[PDB]
Every structure is written in C-alpha cells, then in structure tokens.
RNA sequence: GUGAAGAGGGAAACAACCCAGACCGCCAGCUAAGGUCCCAAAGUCAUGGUUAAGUGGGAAACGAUGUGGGAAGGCCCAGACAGCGUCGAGUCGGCCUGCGCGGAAGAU
RNA sequence: GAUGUCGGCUCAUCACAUCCUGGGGCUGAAGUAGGUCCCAAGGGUAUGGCUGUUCGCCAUUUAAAGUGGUACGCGAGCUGGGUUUAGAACGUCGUGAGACAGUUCGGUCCCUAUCUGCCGUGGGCGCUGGAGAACUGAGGGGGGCUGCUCCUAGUACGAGA
RNA sequence: GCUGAAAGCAUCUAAGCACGAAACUUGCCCCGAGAUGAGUUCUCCCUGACCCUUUAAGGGUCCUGAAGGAACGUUGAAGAC
C-alpha cells in the first residue's frame with residue numbers, strides 16, 4: 080500500500096521490458112526476470128515505475144507492496160549488485176572456493192562441497208570468511224542460508240557458519 | 254540385456270586360498286536375435302532371442318515363418334529383453350556368454366521346482382499345534398482363519414494350503430565365478446531356481 | 461515448541477503470526493516462548 | 499400410448515468438447531446429460547438416446563478452491579488394509595482421463611444402461627483424437 | 640399427538656418426526672411437507688449481501704493482527720503511529736455484532 | 748422353540764493415545780546420556796521360574812519386549828487347567844434335608860460344508876475369419892526389522908571423567 | 909528457511925521460491941488384457957460349384973477339410989483330478 084505508493088526510480092543503464100506482467104530489467108552488472116501477480120499494474124514513465132491495485136482483486140494493494148519491493152531489488156542489484164558475507168567459527172573450520180563450487184571443511188568426516196547457482200558467484204578473503212555476490216536478493220539469501228545450514232551457530236560457543244552480520248545468543252551449560 | 258541359458262547343475266570351484274565356492278553351472282549357448290522391437294512399430298525397445306535347437310517337424314508353420322524371416326535356425330523357445338538407451342542389435346546377430354565377461358553380479362530367473370499342493374506348515378511356515386496334550390485331529394491344521402461376526406468373512410490374501418512352487422522366481426546379485434566362451438559356460442556362486450535342465454534367464458544385477 | 465490450545469504473547473518481544481492456518485507465537489528474545497496452537 | 503424411443507432406430511451424433519479451463523463438475527453434468535440423451539425430446543428412460551462425445555485436453559480441466567491439492571480420490575483394492583488414495587493433482591499426473599471419467603460416471607445412472615451410456619464418452623488427455631472418421635461436430639460446453 | 644389398529648409424499652435408508660387420512664378406475668389438472676447442477680421430477684432463476692473454512696456437510700472452556708457491519712473514544716499538519724533529530728497522513732485499542740479459524744485422537 | 752462361558756494354543760486383522768527404529772522443537776540440552784512436546788503406523792516388538800490364571804512378582808535377555816478394538820478376535824480350528832451337574836471330604840452355617848461370591852480330590856467338548864468368504868486349480872463362452880507365438884502394463888499382491896564392531900577419532904566437546 | 913508486502917518496521921506466506929522422515933508415489937520381486945475399456949507386434953493358413961425362397965449379417969446340396977488343434981500312446985525334476 081504505502082510501499083506501492085512510493086514509485087521506484089529507474090536509473091540510466093537500467094532497461095525496462097514491460098509485456099503484460101513480466102518485468103525484464105537489463106543493467107550493466109547483469110539481467111533479471113520476474114513475472115508478476117495478476118493484481119499488479121506497472122506504469123513505466125519519466126525514468127520511473129509505478130504500482131497500484133487493479134479491480135477484481137481484493138488483495139490488490141498488498142500485491143503492489145510486494146511488487147514494488149521486488150522491483151527496487153532488481154533496480155538495485157544490476158546497478159550496484161547484492162553482496163552477502165559469512166564467517167566460519169570453530170577449531171579448524173576452513174572455507175575455500177574452486178570456480179562455482181565452494182569447498183568447506185566444517186568438522187565432518189567428509190568434505191562438504193557447495194555448488195553456487197548460475198549468476199551467484201563467490202570468493203573467500205580468508206579461510207574463516209566467505210563473500211557471496213549476485214544480482215538477485217532472493218538467490219544470494221537462499222545460497223547463504225544453504226551454507227549456514229551445513230553447520231548452524233550452536234548455543235554454547237557460537238561455532239559453525241554465522242552470517243558475519245548476525246549475533247549468536249550464547250548460554251552457559253548447566 | 255541378459256541371455257537365456259540352461260541349468261546344467263551344481264558343483265564347486267576350489268580357489269588357491271582353500272575356499273570352496275558352490276557354483277551353479279549355466280550352459281549359455283548362442284542367443285540368436287529373432288526380432289528387434291522399436292518405438293515406431295511396437296511402442297517399446299527390445300530384442301527377441303532364441304537359443305538351442307528344435308526338431309524340424311515339431312516347429313509349426315507359424316513359428317517356422319517367424320524364424321525364417323529372421324534368417325535364424327529354430328531354437329527351443331522365444332524370450333524378450335528390454336533394451337536401454339545405449340544399446341542396439343540387429344536381427345540374426347548372435348550374442349554369446351562373453352557379454353558377461355566384465356559383469357560381476359547377475360540376477361538369475363527360473364521356474365522354481367514344483368511342490369504340488371502344499372499345506373500351511375510347508376507353504377507358509379505355520380507352527381504345528383501340540384503333537385499330544387489332548388490335540389484332536391488338529392496337528393498340522395491351520396487353526397483359526399478369522400475373527401467373529403466382525404468382520405464375518407475371511408480376508409483376501411489369507412495364508413492357506415495350495416499349489417506351491419512351479420512359479421517364476423528371481424535370485425538377485427549372484428557373483429559370477431567364471432565365464433568361458435569356449436565351453437559356453439557361465440558359473441555363478443550359489444543356488445538358482447529350477448530343476449536340472451531348466452531354462453534360466455541371466456541378466457546383470459539390477460542392484 | 462509449546463503446543464497448546466491457548467497460545468499468547470509471553471513477553472514484549474513475542475509476536476503472533478498465522479502460518480498455514482496455524483496461530484503461532486514467535487519470539488526473538490526467548491526460545492521457550494515459541495508456541496503453536498494445537 | 500406415449501412414444502417410446504427404439505434402440506435399433508435411435509439417431510446418435512458425434513460431438514467433440516475441449517475440457518481446457520472448464521470447471522470439472524459443471525463440464526461433467528453437461529456430459530452426463532448428453533450421454534443420457536436428456537437434451538432430446540425422444541428421451542426414454544430405458545433407452546440410450548444420448549450422443550457420442552469426445553473430450554479433449556482432460557489434463558487441463560479446472561477445479562476451484564484448494565481441490566487441486568485437497569480433493570482426494572479413494573479406492574479399495576479388495577485386500578484388507580487396501581485403502582488407497584490419490585489427490586486430484588496426482589490423478590492429473592498419472593491418469594488424467596480418469597478425473598473426467600470418474601466425475602461423469604458418478605453422475606450417470608447405475609446399472610447396465612448407465613454403463614452403456616458411459617461407453618459413448620471418449621476422453622483424451624491431449625488435443626488429438628483418432629475419430630476423424632466419425633466427423634465430430636464441435637460442442638461448446 | 641402419532642404408532643398401535645394407518646397406506647401415500649418428505650426426512651438417503653428410518654412404527655412413533657414433518658406433510659397427509661388410501662371406496663374403485665384414468666397415460667388429466669392443482670397443491671402440502673419437502674424440493675428444482677447430474678444420479679433424480681422441477682430455477683445452472685432474478686436482485687443485494689456474507690463465507691474461502693469444502694465452513695456448509697460433528698464437538699466446549701479457552702486462544703487469535705481471519706474477514707464484513709455499527710456506535711462511540713484517543714492522538715494527529717502546535718507533524719501522530721512505525722522506522723527514527725527527521726519523514727508527511729493517518730495512526731492506536733477496546734465496545735457491540737454477522738460469517739469463518741484453532742481447540743478436534745479409534746479401531747474391516 | 749439355546750447367541751458355548753475364563754485362560755492357553757493356532758491363525759490373525761485394524762486403530763494410534765508410538766514400545767523400538769526414522770524426522771523434529773524446547774530443555775534447568777557442554778559431550779555422552781536424559782527430560783518434555785510435536786510428526787510418523789513402513790517394518791519390528793523376549794524366553795523362562797511360580798500360579799488355571801489374564802495379571803503380577805521374580806530370573807535372564809532385547810533396539811524394543813507398546814496401548815487398545817476385533818462377540819473382553821478366534822471351541823462347526825485345537826485344548827479343557829479355572830469355572831457352574833451328578834461322587835466324596837474339611838472349615839463354617841443349620842435341629843435337619845442341605846448350604847457357601849470358602850476350600851479340597853474326581854469328573855463324556857458332536858457335526859461328511861449347501862451358500863457367503865478365503866486358498867488353490869480347471870471347464871465354458873467372449874474378445875467379430877481361423878491359427879501358433881512373443882508382448883505392452885491398466886490394475887493387484889509381496890517386500891520394507893535391526894544389533895554389534897572398526898574407521899572417521901580418543902577428533903569435536905570437556906576441568907577432568 | 910529465502911525473498912516478501914498487507915502492517916513505512918517486522919513477519920517462512922498472503923504472490924513467489926528452497927529444504928525436510930522407515931509414512932505416501934516410484935524404484936526391487938511376482939501375478940496380470942474377462943483391462944467386456946477384452947490392447948499390441950511377428951508369423952502361418954483357407955482364393956470351388958450351385959440351388960432355394962417370407963431376400964438377408966438368410967437356408968440347404970455336392971465338392972472341399974488348410975494352418976492348426978484335439979484325441980490316442982510312451983511319459984516328466986509337472987501334477988489330487
């Protein structure tokens with residue numbers, strides 16, 4: 080509603096292909112594709128995209144708020160990109176990259192290998208840090224959740240794969 | 254694919270390390286492709302094989318013409334094998350026991366030995382009732398076959414007396430002990446279904 | 461997870477959310493306060 | 499005496515129906531009606547006066563609400579414990595013509611004539627039928 | 640009051656409930672209860688609403704930003720509520736009430 | 748104008764309020780191992796001593812020795828120890844015959860299956876000229892348990908254990 | 909869990925997307941076209957004349973008798989039959 084109210088700015092570089100509902104945006108980093116909900120109009124004019132509820136769709140306004148949120152993401156992301164950073168924490172918890180597959184050693188009896196998706200790429204600045212980069216806020220978030228889920232931060236020492244940004248609630252054992 | 258062979262019998266192979274391997278000897282003579290089935294004509298991909306030899310007079314005109322179309326001598330029967338994506342054969346091509354040279358494990362399908370009408374003790378491993386302690390005429394009999402008015406019937410698939418064996422049986426994942434192109438022999442470790450002289454289907458192990 | 465007929469905010473940080481037709485209490489602060497109506 | 503239709507003289511036509519987008523049950527009532535011959539003035543309760551109907555695109559039949567996931571088809575195998583189930587979406591995946599067939603069969607009379615009526619329904623998952631020889635007229639349901 | 644000593648139609652089936660009291664015949668007509676998408680006779684009837692639970696087509700104390708209607712309160716361009724010094728129109732929690740939700744485990 | 752009754756044996760079948768195995772949330776969860784709640788019915792789920800026992804207690808196992816429904820499943824399938832005929836005795840009550848929600852010893856369990864059902868196995872006709880083969884797979888059934896050891900590693904965890 | 913508004917925030921959910929168990933559908937084994945919805949493929953076989961009459965998917969005569977099947981016999985690691 081109020082998210083939908085605020086129209087997303089289209090910068091220079093940031094091509095816009097409206098055709099029914101698909102909103103295919105081609106910036107200079109990359110290119111993105113989203114279908115959209117049948118209760119969303121998209122009115123592109125004046126280097127500026129706008130949203131609103133169409134009739135015969137009670138949810139209408141809610142669907143505009145989601146669609147605006149998704150579009151500011153694709154306007155961002157092919158101009159500046161998205162980045163996410165993870166840390167490893169533990170006795171000998173090493174990360175390593177080898178093309179589009181991240182090699183992790185997270186204290187298993189087997190080396191976990193994580194194949195990054197198409198368009199999501201990654202590099203390790205240390206052995207105990209990982210840096211994901213992409214055009215798409217959802218996929219970079221999903222990949223990082225997949226990495227974190229190998230060895231989730233545990234409640235006593237905070238060991239495992241934290242988001243660098245996150246905080247880990249510790250507890251003293253009984 | 255697999256190959257059709259005959260159960261010669263059982264024997265052993267003594268290894269150099271002093272192990273005695275029980276073997277079934279399978280005579281796998283040349284399997285001659287009688288018909289190639291394809292997706293266009295038949296709706297599925299397979300080869301029909303024959304093996305062995307049939308008396309000239311006991312081959313019927315309908316059967317003789319089927320063999321005649323292939324350019325193959327009549328054998329003792331016809332069997333199909335489903336093809337994978339990779340495979341192709343031609344009508345008339347012979348396939349020998351050397352197909353199994355690098356195969357480590359086989360499934361062997363035969364017709365089990367016929368036991369005729371078997372009771373529940375033999376057929377289903379039912380327990381006998383008391384030999385003594387007053388048992389009246391009910392030593393190997395099945396006991397109860399249901400409940401009461403609820404449900405007031407016997408359920409389908411109830412284990413009862415009847416025909417036992419003389420049916421198709423596969424035994425899976427038998428180790429190939431030896432292949433011998435020269436004498437048309439495949440040796441597999443352990444027992445396989447069927448009487449001596451019975452037809453066996455041997456395929457590479459699915460598991 | 462507490463599975464209860466009566467589910468309710470136990471602190472200031474507890475939040476009611478309906479997920480898949482189930483009333484749930486989630487709580488950022490306390491794992492004990494996480495609830496499911498059932 | 500009131501007219502009766504006569505089985506050896508009844509005129510039966512061939513029709514073709516596209517099930518794409520049609521609500522299952524509202525399509526099925528119109529099939530069942532026309533298989534029975536309720537649309538004809540010669541309608542006779544003991545005679546099959548209805549028409550042959552081809553149904554195309556049975557895999558694209560629609561259902562409202564959450565029936566695509568939540569509508570369950572139950573059957574028993576006759577063996578104890580043999581209660582089997584499939585959701586509508588699973589039925590669409592494996593045996594898509596059965597969804598329309600099951601729906602129509604439930605709406606036809608029970609007994610020999612009802613079964614005879616059902617034989618005139620020819621349901622196809624695709625957009626092609628093999629019945630060009632019968633010269634199907636397009637029927638808008 | 641009905642059954643008993645009462646048929647017919649309805650309530651799937653169902654003495655005792657609902658409608659209704661069978662003198663006989665009719666391949667006429669109108670109604671009752673109850674019904675009118677197909678099984679199965681008759682509205683895929685019209686108009687305006689509610690429900691999204693297959694609720695309808697089992698179950699309470701109690702729980703809940705489900706959703707519709709009504710009457711008041713509070714704060715609010717002397718810039719509210721949220722995110723926060725700023726940013727620009729609503730925002731807050733009760734009351735009543737319609738319809739839904741969870742609470743809801745059983746044996747062929 | 749009869750629906751055989753406890754317990755056992757044989758054979759089961761279903762429910763899930765789950766005993767084990769599987770998945771998971773919380774823990775006053777360091778690890779190991781527990782507690783509690785949720786999901787889950789695929790399969791699995793002791794032998795003995797005593798007693799008619801079910802049960803229970805006990806011994807020794809097991810991953811576990813689940814809880815219920817099925818005429819407290821199952822005697823036209825078996826048993827007949829309990830119990831409720833006729834014999835006899837004790838305690839007890841009664842003047843007595845006799846009697847006991849007491850005890851004790853002894854004490855006939857029939858049926859050739861017509862129908863349904865179920866397990867097997869044929870004959871008939873059909874399937875559109877007749878015939879011999881090889882098939883496709885709608886559909887149905889079977890199967891689905893789990894211990895211990897070693898490696899990973901005396902590694903993670905822990906003050907150590 | 910991700911992204912994500914409705915509800916500027918938050919929120920696994922309303923749109924959208926990912927994961928997740930011996931349960932479910934498969935994969936393994938066996939039956940299986942009476943699956944009357946009776947399916948498919950390959951092969952084999954039969955290529956005479958004539959009459960009758962309410963003329964019709966009609967009823968006979970003579971000639972013909974295939975492929976194949978059965979029957980009988982010797983039998984089986986198949987079987988109550």
Ligand SMILES: [K+]
Nearest residue numbers: 641644645660
């Ligand atoms: K009366």
Ligand SMILES: [K+]
Nearest residue numbers: 693694695696
């Ligand atoms: K309902």
Ligand SMILES: [K+]
Nearest residue numbers: 760816817820
């Ligand atoms: K039981």
Ligand SMILES: [K+]
Nearest residue numbers: 771772783784
């Ligand atoms: K637990």
Ligand SMILES: [K+]
Nearest residue numbers: 765788789790
């Ligand atoms: K189970």
Ligand SMILES: [K+]
Nearest residue numbers: 401750752818
């Ligand atoms: K009883």
Ligand SMILES: [K+]
Nearest residue numbers: 753754822826
């Ligand atoms: K008994």
Ligand SMILES: [K+]
Nearest residue numbers: 401402822823
């Ligand atoms: K009986």
Ligand SMILES: [K+]
Nearest residue numbers: 390391823824
């Ligand atoms: K008996």
Ligand SMILES: [K+]
Nearest residue numbers: 861862863864
């Ligand atoms: K009967």
Ligand SMILES: [K+]
Nearest residue numbers: 874941946947
């Ligand atoms: K057939």
Ligand SMILES: [Mg+2]
Nearest residue numbers: 366367368369
């Ligand atoms: Mg035998």
Ligand SMILES: [Mg+2]
Nearest residue numbers: 380381382383
């Ligand atoms: Mg025994």
Ligand SMILES: [Mg+2]
Nearest residue numbers: 388389390856
């Ligand atoms: Mg006796």
Ligand SMILES: [Mg+2]
Nearest residue numbers: 388389390391
């Ligand atoms: Mg005896």
Ligand SMILES: [Mg+2]
Nearest residue numbers: 402404405406
């Ligand atoms: Mg019954």
